[PDB]
């Protein structure tokens, strides 16, 4: 039961790329007809906070990654294909703009 | 540009405890009046999927963690206090029940 120091929490939760379990439906929202397997994939994506109403944590460098995913159409069997997903290598706190 | 094998994706995204950036407002929803700093904290929490409509990823062993967080009331300055947060040590896919 050791407390985490304010400086350290602040540091640790500041905007950065963190491994994120993302739903494949979120990434591929036009595929309504399919059920995916697994439902989700791990991706390096921006996360944490900027603690400043004017700033957002956003990717400044991206890259791609490709995985075999099983697409399951009802009464039509399962085909395993390759799907691609963006990943975030660098994140910054940057000004929101409307 | 190397592909991830289906077996490996499946394995890697299956229900497990993963470091998660959680908004403190989510964890402490009665504190409307305060702004927290940082907005969020990193916690080990259950995540990923069970790929089976009948199952949910849920914690089977929990523990606590304590952090200094800055509470900011408007026109009333900032006080740094200790807040506690549940963490998830073990996760299982378990049957949903209504």
């Amino acid at each position, epitope marked *: 039961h050791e407390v985490v120091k304010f400086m350290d929490v*602040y540091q*640790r939760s500041y905007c*950065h790329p963190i491994e994120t379990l993302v739903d494949i439906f979120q990434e591929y929202p036009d595929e309504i007809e399919y059920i995916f397997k697994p439902s989700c994939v791990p991706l390096m994506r921006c996360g944490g906070c900027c603690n400043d109403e004017g700033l957002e944590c956003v990717p400044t460098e991206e890259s791609n990654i490709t995985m075999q995913i099983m697409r399951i159409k009802p009464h039509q069997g399962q085909h395993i294909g390759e799907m691609s997903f963006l990943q975030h290598n660098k994140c910054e706190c940057r000004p929101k703009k409307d | 540009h190397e592909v991830v094998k289906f077996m490996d994706v499946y394995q890697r995204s299956y229900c497990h405890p993963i470091e998660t950036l959680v908004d403190i407002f989510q964890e402490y929803p009665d504190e409307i009046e305060y702004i927290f700093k940082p907005s969020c904290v990193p916690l080990m929490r259950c995540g990923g999927c069970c790929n089976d409509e009948g199952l949910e990823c849920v914690p089977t062993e929990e523990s606590n963690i304590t952090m200094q967080i800055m509470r900011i009331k408007p026109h009333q300055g900032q006080h740094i206090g200790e807040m506690s947060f549940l963490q998830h040590n073990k996760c299982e896919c378990r049957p949903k029940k209504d």
Partner: antibody
Amino acid sequence: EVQLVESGGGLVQPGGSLRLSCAASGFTINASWIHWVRQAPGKGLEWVGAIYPYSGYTNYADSVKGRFTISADTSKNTAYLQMNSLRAEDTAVYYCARWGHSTSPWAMDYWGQGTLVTVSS
Amino acid sequence: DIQMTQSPSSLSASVGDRVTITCRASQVIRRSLAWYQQKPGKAPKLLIYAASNLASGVPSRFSGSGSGTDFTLTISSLQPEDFATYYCQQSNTSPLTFGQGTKVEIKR
């Protein structure tokens, strides 16, 4: 044009006191964290402590706790390192430096020139 | 406290050599390692932050990598003015401990 300017370096008696001062321009120290780092002559850098001027939060090295006090003056845009009960092994060049939103935390991209605090009878 | 162990303590390389300097953390540091260069009697200069990003306006021959507890600064083509002492620093847990620095010499 961000710079940090230090002053206050000098000679001091063992046991005595000194207030290093770190004057910012080009940004507001309020909207950032100021750290202090020192370097014993010939040795490597050691972190002294930091301050979050918005709130006055401070965090110090165990090697320096209870003796040193970091402080800030948002109106005068200036941080301060207050040295008490000084020792021989406290003889070093003292740096202040700042962390802002441009970099991820504690990567400090602008520093002061450094003053030499030398503790001697 | 987290101990940071740099290696080598000193190295001597020729101009245009690719030089690497490793830094090893006693526990995991998420990726919060930064690399500073220090020319004698001057403030350190930030080179790399968050393990792997180039600090603004630093020459690209400077490159950082590593994940876990093992990290590396790489100068890809050592230049006459790269002569300096390089330090790594860990930001994950106070105190913010530095490596003991690697003292790079140009061999001519």
